[PDB]
């Protein structure tokens, strides 16, 4: 029993973390086989960040312009290319700790574990969600750039995030492992800001199922709703609209608890209109939206406390 924001175990990722220095900038890189991935802005100084041309800054670099350090061992760079907003550094050694891996592009609403690193040394691990506005609410200090996000299926690490920047609101932006950013953001210091965010409806719903699987039914009601009547309520409370596809995904959780999705949607609709007042769900005073349906199935018992 219990329900916690839970990260994947981080050791497969830890044995991949290195330090990358170009000139006076130092940050983290990801070492798989004979490649090290990192943010291209490692080639930038503070003044170039205002208006950098990366093609022009990069061509001025050689292989020995880059220092890669794995523990106390220096890796020798023997090739380098730019891929979108990443650098790919070829090194003289394959990482012997390379796990089975994939590079995936995560969709808004999905969750992943972040291994926060400074100087190529892992310092902590936490879970977060890709927000609808393409930011993550992370915890990152100077030097965390090139820290990665990942999920783990069996023994395969699916890398989905590399850290690049912090926006003026205190939330975070970065790229997949192809160097393509999440959201309309760019790796230069300009006036750019998080777009307006919305609550992830699918997740809230899933976490209400989680509550039921663990044994709580207090927020249920005798009502049902149409998909469309729910969305008229949703949209006034700044929830994402629910789609038939989201209703579909909730099938297994629906089947485990015997609660019809649109019946749980009526239950949510009532929580939005009436509040919780004094009452908690799974320990929480508020409606939580950073657990996917998948996160709930993975963590909860397959057997409902009826």
């Amino acid at each position: 029993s219990g329900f916690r924001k839970m990260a994947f175990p981080s050791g497969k990722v830890e044995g991949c973390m290195v330090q990358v220095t170009c000139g006076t900038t130092t940050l983290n890189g990801l070492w798989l086989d004979d490649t090290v991935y990192c943010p291209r802005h490692v080639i930038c100084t503070a003044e170039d960040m205002l208006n950098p041309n990366y093609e022009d800054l990069l061509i001025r670099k050689s292989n020995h312009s880059f220092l890669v350090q794995a523990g106390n061992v220096q890796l020798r760079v023997i090739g380098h290319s730019m891929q979108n907003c990443l650098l790919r550094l070829k090194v003289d050694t394959s990482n012997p700790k390379t796990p089975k891996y994939k590079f995936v592009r995560i969709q808004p609403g999905q969750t992943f574990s972040v291994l926060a690193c400074y100087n190529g040394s892992p310092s902590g691990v936490y879970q977060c969600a890709m927000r609808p506005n393409h930011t993550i609410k992370g915890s990152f200090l100077n030097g965390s750039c090139g820290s990665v996000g990942f999920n783990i299926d069996y023994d395969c690490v699916s890398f989905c995030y590399m850290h690049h920047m912090e926006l003026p609101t205190g939330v975070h932006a970065g790229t997949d492992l192809e160097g393509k950013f999440y959201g309309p953001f760019v790796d230069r210091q300009t006036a750019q800001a998080a777009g307006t965010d919305t609550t992830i409806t699918l997740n809230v719903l899933a976490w209400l199922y989680a509550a039921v699987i663990n044994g709580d039914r207090w927020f249920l009601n005798r009502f049902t709703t149409t998909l469309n009547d729910f969305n008229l309520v949703a949209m006034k409370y700044n929830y994402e609209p629910l789609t038939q596809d989201h209703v579909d995904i909730l099938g297994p959780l629906s089947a485990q608890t015997g609660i019809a999705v649109l019946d749980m949607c009526a239950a949510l609709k009532e929580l939005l209109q009436n509040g919780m007042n004094g009452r908690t769900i799974l320990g929480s005073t508020i409606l939580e939206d950073e657990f996917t349906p998948f996160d709930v199935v993975r963590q909860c018992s397959g057997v409902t406390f009826q």
């Binding site: 930038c44 990152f140 100077n142 030097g143 690049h164 920047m165 912090e166 210091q189």
Partner: peptide, 4 residues
């Protein structure tokens, strides 16, 4: 809005 800093690169980190």
């Amino acid at each position: 809005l800093a690169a980190x």
